[PDB]
Symmetry: C3
Subunit: 214 residues, 3 copies
């Protein structure tokens, strides 16, 4: 019955990025990171990597509730991301920065995750544009997986083989919750990787995933 999105806050004159309280579909308050600069601002950031201070190789219960720090890296929580994206349409933007401070991005028409009972299934709309290329449409219609809850399409455990948590199939083309392996790495596809961007052997300095009413 007040601000429901970061877009609402932007329209009310909140021009600086930072943490604000919004009110979810059910009226539950949630303190979220608003990106008010990028691409018109008004984005609610649900994932952020910047320096490798936080361990992202976490189990189901931890990804469900969210983890990390307001002062740095975090995953907002799958329950929260479902609430955020349940009804209406949120467009997704992915922002990626390499160690030479070059920026890439990918933008999708719509994005949402189902509730826990449906394994926080990815529901993704068309790739609109992005200098990072499209490395997420591959994962469309897939259950989320973590090390202790394998819902993927591999005989082995993708979350373990690539040290992350994602909507793994057999196995991935993106892996943003992968290990903070600074820049080029010999090890295959176990960093913060975006196949169509810098490839399976380059772990980004910065990663942000964010949503805005479409």
């Amino acid at each position: 019955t007040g601000p429901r999105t970061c877009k609402d806050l932007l329209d009310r004159g909140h021009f600086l990025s930072g943490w604000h309280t919004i009110y979810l579909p059910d009226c539950r308050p949630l303190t979220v990171l608003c990106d008010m600069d990028t691409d018109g601002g008004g984005w609610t950031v649900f994932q952020r990597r910047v320096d490798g201070s936080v361990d992202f190789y976490r189990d189901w219960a931890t990804y469900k509730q969210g983890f990390g720090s307001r002062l740095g890296e975090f995953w907002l929580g799958n329950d929260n991301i479902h609430a955020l994206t349940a009804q209406g349409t949120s467009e997704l933007r992915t922002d990626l920065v390499d160690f030479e401070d070059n920026y890439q991005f990918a933008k999708y028409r719509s994005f949402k995750v189902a509730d826990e009972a449906e394994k926080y299934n990815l529901v993704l709309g068309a790739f609109v544009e992005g200098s990072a290329g499209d490395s997420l449409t591959f994962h469309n219609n897939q259950s989320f997986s973590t090390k202790d809850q394998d819902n993927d399409l591999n005989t082995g455990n993708c979350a373990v083989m690539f040290q992350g948590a994602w909507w793994y199939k057999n196995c991935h083309t993106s892996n943003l919750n992968g290990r903070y392996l600074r820049g080029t790495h010999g090890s295959f596809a176990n960093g913060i990787n975006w196949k169509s961007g810098k490839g399976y052997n380059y772990s980004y300095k910065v990663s942000e995933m964010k949503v805005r009413p479409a």
Copy 2:
């Protein structure tokens, strides 16, 4: 009714016992709430920080409308916004402090007895009081009584465009001895005077690690 009971400046906050720097809501003269960064640590504390550079994560080469409303992040770097800075300095007398740190941990500062920014109709004209003291030396008096300029709105006193030439936004004259909204060029640069430069401090070829501009009632 929290406008009448709420703090109106960072100094009110310090007086109420907030001893750590951090973002707090204050109430502007027209009762509009604004979340600002208070500096409680430096020089007696109670300063409202309106510009901060720290790591080059935010692009400061922005247009008139963006400087007007403010941009950046409470997580790090930002410009509070010219409308806000006018609102903060329109009434009474605010002193100004500039804190600068180089990449070798050398701290420098400059202090001015008063600092006032006019409204948009006057293009955010700078009215600067006397230089008080400072190891950074005085690189702002030169800019007294100049309109603010951005790349897309040239209000400087140069035949060309200072904001474009020096890749920032400032109360440019013809053109500058300070350029704190310049590019984050990380230490010494070969390019001329287009970084976070304070001439009397580290010169036209050295871009500071940290910049903060802040005001306090005096």
Copy 3:
């Protein structure tokens, strides 16, 4: 003991604040204080009262500064001796100390009990048994000892350890740890005047990160 709102960061965690960051708690008879909650480390629910991370803040401060606290929520701070006593008195608050080096290697110590008494009583450190910690014990030595600053010599050394080692601490024969020391950025030739944990990295290495925190045992 507040029953109207959150008393500790532990309370906040059990209420569903799962991200670390600055929150408001209600101290014991029942004043508000905005504190840094660490919700990830060792199960979460830690209230952080010291933090070093980048050397932006001068920790070589006098008695009155350490009393009321200083620093910034954006980085380095000391919560204030008055706040720390109000927070820990009794209690049985678990003390934890987190330490990180310049190649991102993690160490950290834990203690079963922690409190400082009020100003009258020199904010004496009262420490319970060391429990565990890959950093080793460099705080027990300092048990039952006055806090000292540059303008308040309360150690057992003929000189002033605070000036000699450039900080503030529960110095005695001097120190075995110096977390409020100078941010000397890794290895240093100057002796023991840095953010040092003798059992961890000794008197010649200044840590990159250092956090002292508490949670109800």
